[PDB]
Amino acid sequence: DLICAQKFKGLTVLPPLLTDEMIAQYTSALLAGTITSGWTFGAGAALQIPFAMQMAYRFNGIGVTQNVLYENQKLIANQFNSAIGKIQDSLSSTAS
Amino acid sequence: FCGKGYHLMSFPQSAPHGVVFLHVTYVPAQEKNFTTAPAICHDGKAHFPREGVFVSNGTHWFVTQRNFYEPQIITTDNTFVSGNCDVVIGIVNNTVYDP
Amino acid sequence: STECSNLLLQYGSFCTQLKRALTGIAVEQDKNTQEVFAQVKQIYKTPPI
Amino acid sequence: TMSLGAENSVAYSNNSIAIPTNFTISVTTEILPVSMTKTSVDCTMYICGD
Ligand SMILES: *[C@@H]1O[C@H](CO)[C@@H](O[C@@H]2O[C@H](CO)[C@@H](O[C@@H]3O[C@H](CO)[C@@H](O)[C@H](O)[C@@H]3O)[C@H](O)[C@H]2NC(C)=O)[C@H](O)[C@H]1NC(C)=O
Ligand SMILES: *[C@@H]1O[C@H](CO)[C@@H](O[C@@H]2O[C@H](CO)[C@@H](O[C@@H]3O[C@H](CO)[C@@H](O)[C@H](O)[C@@H]3O)[C@H](O)[C@H]2NC(C)=O)[C@H](O)[C@H]1NC(C)=O
Ligand SMILES: *[C@@H]1O[C@H](CO)[C@@H](O[C@@H]2O[C@H](CO)[C@@H](O[C@@H]3O[C@H](CO)[C@@H](O)[C@H](O)[C@@H]3O)[C@H](O)[C@H]2NC(C)=O)[C@H](O)[C@H]1NC(C)=O
Ligand SMILES: *[C@@H]1O[C@H](CO)[C@@H](O[C@@H]2O[C@H](CO)[C@@H](O)[C@H](O)[C@H]2NC(C)=O)[C@H](O)[C@H]1NC(C)=O
Ligand SMILES: *[C@@H]1O[C@H](CO)[C@@H](O[C@@H]2O[C@H](CO)[C@@H](O)[C@H](O)[C@H]2NC(C)=O)[C@H](O)[C@H]1NC(C)=O
């Protein structure tokens, strides 16, 4: 009995043009493109590349050679998995 | 930011109460399928590319730049040695030419 | 109030600009989401594996 | 119902890569406003004309 109180005084609300499903589709498409292509999909046609090789190039882009990744891939994957898992615990807490 | 793609240069033009930019960009085209490997083992040592990728056309192995297909013979000046052949997941046996 | 409708007509156009401003705000609100999210012309799919 | 775009799928694999063999030069435009009209209002004539 809150929206009707304002509606009965000539104060309406219009729905957004894009629904939630379309925004979810956009986000999923962006994630899939980033995972399977890297940055090539943002400058033309998408070109596939293995994820480890893409991570090696990303390390090379910040001044660290790729052999570091090719030798610490397992540790890096474990650290990334733990960091992602901690985000769920952080968000699910009452402290919003 | 300056056009879509890989920016090269821009040209300004004047408009009434405004301005118009002409962005020149670089767009790749006509891609092809290749087989790739992260490293190559020659004599118990792992070789990594310097500024390229490892590709194969089916029988042989080459090294080429990442933005334009230009195969070249794998040579000790194209690769650097770091480690052995039992720490890399996906290493491929091949030979490295000595110039 | 049928009389108030006639009385308010003596104040000129105090309703057209309000409606125009609100419509512009709504259009800008749609344009914001279109600019932020609609950045890809293709809908990619993740592999089954 | 509006369509978000064309469906596509990327052929991801353990060992596969795509390398372009040609390029295209593209020129695009972009328009940005800079300034607007300068206006002046005279109170005496507008409010109390003569
Ligand atoms: C993948 O790339 C390699 C690059 O070396 C290709 O090997 C080369 O293939 C060409 C085409 O057949 C060979 O040229 C031929 O040589 C023979 C003998 O000299 C000559 O009689 C023919 O008329 C022709 O010119 C070339 O020798 C060969 N090079 C080597 C080192 O083997 C290979 O064919 C490519 N594979 C695919 C599937 O494209
Ligand atoms: C690249 O080349 C290396 C050698 O140049 C290959 O190493 C191979 O490793 C296997 C491991 O199983 C060796 O097999 C051996 O078989 C004997 C048979 O009795 C067994 O007693 C040993 O315990 C061992 O299992 C194999 O001999 C060895 N190759 C050579 C030439 O010695 C490697 O597999 C090649 N490929 C890759 C992806 O590294
Ligand atoms: C990379 O792409 C360019 C186009 O952006 C390719 O150049 C094009 O090549 C074709 C065939 O060689 C040309 O078609 C022919 O043009 C002649 C011109 O007199 C015409 O008489 C023929 O009937 C035929 O249409 C096309 O004109 C040409 N485009 C340009 C802008 O020059 C180039 O070949 C590609 N590179 C590779 C390695 O594939
Ligand atoms: C590289 O190879 C892959 C798989 O062999 C190609 O992907 C296929 O493309 C055809 C296009 O006619 C589709 O019908 C298949 O469904 C695709 N397969 C998969 C698994 O997606 C890909 O097109 C090749 N690259 C190029 C540039 O042609
Ligand atoms: C190759 O790709 C597969 C899947 O795309 C990777 O995962 C393997 O999949 C097979 C198929 O059932 C399983 O038997 C393996 O156990 C999977 N591997 C792991 C580590 O779980 C696979 O790792 C990739 N690499 C190789 C060398 O196969």
Which residue matches tokens 């890399």? B88
Mutation test of the interface with chain A: which of C1, C28, C34, C44, choosing the one with the most A Cβ atoms within 10 A?
Answer: C44
Q: How far apart are CA C32 and CA C49, in angstroms?
A: 35
D15 touches chain A (CB under 8 A): yes
To which H or E segment does residue A54 belong? helix A51-60
* DSSP line for B20-72: EEEEEEEEEEEEEEEEE-S-EESSS-EEEESSSEEEESSS-EEEE-TTS---B
Tell me how far the alpha carbon of residue B44 lies from the centroid of ligand 2, in angstroms: 12
- Which ligand does the CA of A46 lie closest to? 4
Neighbours of D49 (CB within 10 A): 6
The 8-class DSSP code of residue B88 comes to S
Are the C-beta atoms of C18 and A19 separated by less than 8 Å? Answer: no
Q: Is the CB of B60 within 6 Å of ligand 1? A: yes
Q: How was this structure determined?
A: cryo-EM
Strands B18-36 and D17-33, sheet pairing: antiparallel
From the CA of A4, how many Å to the nearest CA of chain C?
20
Are the C-beta atoms of A36 and D16 separated by less than 8 Å? Answer: no
Are the C-beta atoms of B90 and B38 separated by less than 8 Å? Answer: yes
Nearest to B26 by CA among B2, B44, B58: B2
Asked whether A and C share 3 or more beta-carbon pairs under 8 angstroms, the answer is yes
- Between the CA atoms of B60, B73, B37 and A61, what dihedral angle is there, to the nearest 10 degrees? -160
Q: Tell me how many degrees the CA angle C38-C40-C46 measures, rounded to the nearest 5.
A: 115
Neighbours of A24 (CB within 10 A): 10
- Between the CA atoms of B56, B58, B61 and B63, what dihedral angle is there, to the nearest 10 degrees? -20
* DSSP line for C1-49: -HHHHHHHGGG-SSSHHHHHHHHHHHHHHHHHHHHHH---SEE------
